Amino acid sequence: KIVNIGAVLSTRKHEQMFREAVNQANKRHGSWKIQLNATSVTHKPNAIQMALSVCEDLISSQVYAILVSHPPTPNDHFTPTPVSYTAGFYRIPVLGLTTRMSIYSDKSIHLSFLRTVPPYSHQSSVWFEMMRVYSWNHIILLVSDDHEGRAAQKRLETLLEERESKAEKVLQFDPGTKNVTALLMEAKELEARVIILSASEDDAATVYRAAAMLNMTGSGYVWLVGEREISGNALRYAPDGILGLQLINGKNESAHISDAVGVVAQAVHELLEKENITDPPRGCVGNTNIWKTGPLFKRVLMSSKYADGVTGRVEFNEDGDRKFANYSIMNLQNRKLVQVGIYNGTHVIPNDRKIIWPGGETEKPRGYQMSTRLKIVTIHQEPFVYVKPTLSDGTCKEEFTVNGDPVKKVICTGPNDTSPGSPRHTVPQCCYGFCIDLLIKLARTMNFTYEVHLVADGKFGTQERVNNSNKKEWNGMMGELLSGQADMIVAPLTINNERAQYIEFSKPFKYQGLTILVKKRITGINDPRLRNPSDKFIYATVKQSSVDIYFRRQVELSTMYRHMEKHNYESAAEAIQAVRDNKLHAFIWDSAVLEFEASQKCDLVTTGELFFRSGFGIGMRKDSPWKQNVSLSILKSHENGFMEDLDKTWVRYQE
Amino acid sequence: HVSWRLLDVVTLELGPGGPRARTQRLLRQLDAPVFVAYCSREEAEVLFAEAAQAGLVGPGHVWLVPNLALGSTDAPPATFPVGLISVVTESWRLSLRQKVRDGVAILALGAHSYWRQHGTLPAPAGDCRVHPGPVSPAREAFYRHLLNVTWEGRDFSFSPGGYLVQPTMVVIALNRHRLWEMVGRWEHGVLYMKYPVWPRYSDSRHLTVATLE
Amino acid sequence: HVSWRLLDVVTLELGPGGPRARTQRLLRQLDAPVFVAYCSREEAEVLFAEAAQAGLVGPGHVWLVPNLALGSTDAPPATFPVGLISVVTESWRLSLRQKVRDGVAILALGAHSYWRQHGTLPAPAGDCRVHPGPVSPAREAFYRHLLNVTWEGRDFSFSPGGYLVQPTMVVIALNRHRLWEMVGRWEHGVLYMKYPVWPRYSASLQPVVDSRHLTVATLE
Numbered sequence A: 001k002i003v004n005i006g007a008v009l010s011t012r013k014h015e016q017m018f019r020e021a022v023n024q025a026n027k028r029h030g031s032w033k034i035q036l037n038a039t040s041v042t043h044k045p046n047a048i049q050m051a052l053s054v055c056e057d058l059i060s061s062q063v064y065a066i067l068v069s070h071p072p073t074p075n076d077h078f079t080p081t082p083v084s085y086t087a088g089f090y091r092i093p094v095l096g097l098t099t100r101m102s103i104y105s106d107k108s109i110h111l112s113f114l115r116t117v118p119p120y121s122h123q124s125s126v127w128f129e130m131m132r133v134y135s136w137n138h139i140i141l142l143v144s145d146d147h148e149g150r151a152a153q154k155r156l157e158t159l160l161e162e163r164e165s166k167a168e169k170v171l172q173f174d175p176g177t178k179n180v181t182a183l184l185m186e187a188k189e190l191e192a193r194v195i196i197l198s199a200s201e202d203d204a205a206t207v208y209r210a211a212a213m214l215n216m217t218g219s220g221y222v223w224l225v226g227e228r229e230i231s232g233n234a235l236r237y238a239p240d241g242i243l244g245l246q247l248i249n250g251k252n253e254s255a256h257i258s259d260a261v262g263v264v265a266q267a268v269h270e271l272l273e274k275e276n277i278t279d280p281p282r283g284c285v286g287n288t289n290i291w292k293t294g295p296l297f298k299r300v301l302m303s304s305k306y307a308d309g310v311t312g313r314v315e316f317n318e319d320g321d322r323k324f325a326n327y328s329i330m331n332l333q334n335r336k337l338v339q340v341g342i343y344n345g346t347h348v349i350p351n352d353r354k355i356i357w358p359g360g361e362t363e364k365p366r367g368y369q370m371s372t373r374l375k376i377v378t379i380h381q382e383p384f385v386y387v388k389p390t391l392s393d394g395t396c397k398e399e400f401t402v403n404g405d406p407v408k409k410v411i412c413t414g415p416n417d418t419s420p421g422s423p424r425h426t427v428p429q430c431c432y433g434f435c436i437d438l439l440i441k442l443a444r445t446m447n448f449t450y451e452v453h454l455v456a457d458g459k460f461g462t463q464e465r466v467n468n469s470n471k472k473e474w475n476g477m478m479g480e481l482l483s484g485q486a487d488m489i490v491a492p493l494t495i496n497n498e499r500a501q502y503i504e505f506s507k508p509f510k511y512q513g514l515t516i517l518v519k520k521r522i523t524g525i526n527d528p529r530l531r532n533p534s535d536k537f538i539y540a541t542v543k544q545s546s547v548d549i550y551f552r553r554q555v556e557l558s559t560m561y562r563h564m565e566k567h568n569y570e571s572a573a574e575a576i577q578a579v580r581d582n583k584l585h586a587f588i589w590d591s592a593v594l595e596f597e598a599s600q601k602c603d604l605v606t607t608g609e610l611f612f613r614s615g616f617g618i619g620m621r622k623d624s625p626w627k628q629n630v631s632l633s634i635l636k637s638h639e640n641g642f643m644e645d646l647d648k649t650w651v652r653y654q655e
Numbered sequence B: 001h002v003s004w005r006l007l008d009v010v011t012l013e014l015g016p017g018g019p020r021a022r023t024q025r026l027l028r029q030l031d032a033p034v035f036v037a038y039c040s041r042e043e044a045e046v047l048f049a050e051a052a053q054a055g056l057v058g059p060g061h062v063w064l065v066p067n068l069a070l071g072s073t074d075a076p077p078a079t080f081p082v083g084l085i086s087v088v089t090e091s092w093r094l095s096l097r098q099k100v101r102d103g104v105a106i107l108a109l110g111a112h113s114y115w116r117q118h119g120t121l122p123a124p125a126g127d128c129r130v131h132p133g134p135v136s137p138a139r140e141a142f143y144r145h146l147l148n149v150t151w152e153g154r155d156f157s158f159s160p161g162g163y164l165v166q167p168t169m170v171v172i173a174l175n176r177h178r179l180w181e182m183v184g185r186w187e188h189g190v191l192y193m194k195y196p197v198w199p200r201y202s203d204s205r206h207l208t209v210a211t212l213e
Numbered sequence C: 001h002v003s004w005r006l007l008d009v010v011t012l013e014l015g016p017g018g019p020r021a022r023t024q025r026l027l028r029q030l031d032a033p034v035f036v037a038y039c040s041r042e043e044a045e046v047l048f049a050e051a052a053q054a055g056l057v058g059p060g061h062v063w064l065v066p067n068l069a070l071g072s073t074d075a076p077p078a079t080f081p082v083g084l085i086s087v088v089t090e091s092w093r094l095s096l097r098q099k100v101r102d103g104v105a106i107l108a109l110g111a112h113s114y115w116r117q118h119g120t121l122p123a124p125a126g127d128c129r130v131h132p133g134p135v136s137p138a139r140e141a142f143y144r145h146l147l148n149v150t151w152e153g154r155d156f157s158f159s160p161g162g163y164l165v166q167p168t169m170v171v172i173a174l175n176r177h178r179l180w181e182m183v184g185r186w187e188h189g190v191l192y193m194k195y196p197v198w199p200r201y202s203a204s205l206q207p208v209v210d211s212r213h214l215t216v217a218t219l220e
């Protein structure tokens, strides 16, 4: 049978190579069982006439496919659109010998379209593999607004969220822009120092100029770009040591033609033995129909593999991506590029010389340039953090103890000293006690400097979703860590699942539970006087706290929680006084806070014992590089007996 | 805010009647009170036909499909379930003359909206044979001024994405006459409904109960 | 005990002559991590060749076949997936002379055990040309006595239907070098296994471990 295929090129010389390839592939099977022809057209400066010419090419024969290539024109985006749309009307399968834009993969918009070269989006897999190899976890992603940048970012975020790690910071600048120092300035003020670039050549050059002006291209940094950003005028001026990557043998335009014709022949041979010989559309006018077996031909073509291609084994992705093309790692060794390793998209094999980095050093850089000035946020809790006013001399009055050594103190700022009515006022105070001493030991153990301060609301911190919105932002101290106000939390913070979702803790240093305080029938949470509302006994807690979540996390206790929704304190030891004034019947709260005051002052008793047990722990931002050392210090403190000596000092000196 | 506890999601492959066996088994072993399906009009005739064989069209179950299907709203086809719910933008009953009137009205409204600014009546591009129009001149205002313009008390705010944002849209269903009927509007983001209780018109499910204080 | 959730049962014409395309379509449309198939040797070869064509022989799936298939047991042909599992009876590796010796031992033990009751081997009845004989109680008693027998560890107890009951079956599987090998014994209703996990192979023959799998240690 006479089987006909088509093609479109621009060489007028490699078209001879196309006809030679189709004849040589006809030498593989030529018993007339199927017989192959070949047609061709050239490109034109006008697009509408180009579409009409592809129309007339299509009518010329009973064509089974189309092969389109990139002409000497510099507008590489729209060049294969007039052939794809027109033929896309009749579901005629097409192939792309060389095109990299990531819009042709949207199968809902270009109905029938394939490829033999991976798009610009697939580089994210190579970047992820390199990150896994070199172990750089804190990354910064700088991208553009054009569809290609969004697609690349979406793929990289898909991988990172598949490992549930996320990105340190994502920031994008609109395309065709200049004098954009603001965004690099915004990205400069973080601990993560590896930045990943993807933009056009001119934008790459502009970013290079700005970054070189901002000193951010020297030592301590590593930033690796794609392939579109080390070509042309962008390659002219760039900092030394920029990692990159190039295709296996792309832009040959004649190596892929043999593979295209081979796979087309392999597909058409398998297609022709099917019952439905619809026979491709004939005519560009009047025929307002589709090809009756176009989808079937595309499906068989997709799942047809090749044995020995000049560019390697050929398979197709779910949309026609090249599926395991090679990749070559690059570098900038003093104004001249070089090959450093070959990665096949699954793994990277360094098969070349050593790689130099921007600072000229030879040892591998690590990200997260660790700061030394850390903010700290805490709350007013009696047994742990005492707040006091300072004197006029500038130092809070000294206070010796029976041991023979003084009590450590520090200066804590932040509040108005009057929560209910305060227009605007921040005052300096003094803080001391248990957690402050623990912070003293921690800081002296791991070489750092602290600047303590207090929260702006007074509540511990609890997730909530305000009305007229779909996003929920944490409130109070817990929010302060996420939004960037603080860096660490040295305070009695309990460890619940909801907190553990977005922050990460150290090992616990004090275990406890929840219990009840009563002024000297009251018992645990089983009595009908408690399960049901009655005026004889009234229970309450502190609003916007953990116990609120614990009592809203249980359907079968709804009514009881509702009771708590009626009235509760946004308070402190003030609640202990409200119990003292016979206003409140009983109190339910953490074990240590109640047990200290009960045995400390007078006339108050703890009811029964604990029922729900939990610990106390330091809070730190997600995957911060300090947690391991903090936990190793806490365990060492537990093993020494220092938390024992510290414990008697502050809690066992009572009764 | 509601819990929205979902049972299963299934991806079928249904077309011409050659490969129509695996989808049968997949559709056989899934059960639910409510179904939300996504297919084209040339494929609902296969989906519902196979569903009517595995007991999924009785009054116990109820269906909801977007506006991509049911393309010929004038004459609904057979084998469709009685009483499936879909959503259609406003002016689904309008006449073709009314539609062209609305189009010319919105275009002229934008043109005269710029005219009140006394700037110009910009001329189009030249032709197709030159491949002209390299950059966007001060003509870019025109397109922008073609967005907010309303007409006859109908919000026609067009998004930067080329589709209108926040219109009024209605809900339709197939009564026991096989002709669509309006159910409830969506004016200003509050649902209206013509039926306080779903009719369930026409083994079985969905049994009614009674109780008193 | 367990529910044994069954997925799909398929009967396909796997003879010498037939439409290959229909069975290709039927086999290409399936998804289940365990397959159990019952065919004959030629049908087994055809089925396995077709399955290898339609991607069902890689490291993901598992096959099980009764002893009716597997042929010779000393010449495994091509297209047989590595990891094919079967259950053969005891003495799947003995010699022909040894098996004849076992048969003569069974006959001799039966006759001897008959003597310890009545004391004589019954006379023959071989009138093939004359073909006589209504029911005969003497040979009936001899046969009734011939059912049960033991021999130094191997017990050959025959059911009324002429197949032995309670044998010691042995599981076998195709090693990574196309050579049958024992995997698990079976004696008195309890199964054993050579491996605590099913070793799973690949096309290049380097064995892989599933991602959702791990080994846990502990003690008392």
Ligand SMILES: *[C@@H]1O[C@H](CO)[C@@H](O[C@@H]2O[C@H](CO)[C@@H](O)[C@H](O)[C@H]2NC(C)=O)[C@H](O)[C@H]1NC(C)=O
Binding pocket: A037, A038, A039, A040, A060, A061
């Ligand atoms: C096989 O291909 C050749 C060329 O690829 C076709 O011949 C062309 O036919 C068109 C008809 O409009 C002419 O304009 C070209 O000048 C022809 N080119 C050559 C090189 O002859 C031929 O028609 C194809 N075979 C069939 C059966 O159509």
Ligand SMILES: *[C@@H]1O[C@H](CO)[C@@H](O[C@@H]2O[C@H](CO)[C@@H](O)[C@H](O)[C@H]2NC(C)=O)[C@H](O)[C@H]1NC(C)=O
Binding pocket: B117, B141, B144, B145, B147, B148, B149
């Ligand atoms: C409709 O939206 C446009 C913005 O796209 C509004 O603003 C006009 O924007 C152009 C920008 O080229 C200005 O030069 C005009 O001066 C702006 N408004 C006018 C009319 O002067 C426009 O105001 C919006 N109209 C409505 C209905 O509010």
Ligand SMILES: *[C@@H]1O[C@H](CO)[C@@H](O)[C@H](O)[C@H]1NC(C)=O
Binding pocket: A249, A252, A254, A255, A310
């Ligand atoms: C293209 O590929 C061929 C085959 O590998 C090679 O000989 C040739 O040098 C490559 N480049 C060009 C420009 O042809």
Ligand SMILES: *[C@@H]1O[C@H](CO)[C@@H](O)[C@H](O)[C@H]1NC(C)=O
Binding pocket: A370, A625, A626, A629
């Ligand atoms: C953690 O502690 C080790 C020694 O215990 C030290 O070498 C390392 O630099 C510390 N890391 C950080 C981030 O402080």
Ligand SMILES: *[C@@H]1O[C@H](CO)[C@@H](O)[C@H](O)[C@H]1NC(C)=O
Binding pocket: C113, C144, C145, C146, C147, C148
């Ligand atoms: C079964 O075994 C017993 C034990 O030796 C033997 O006495 C008997 O003859 C055998 N056969 C029958 C039918 O019991």
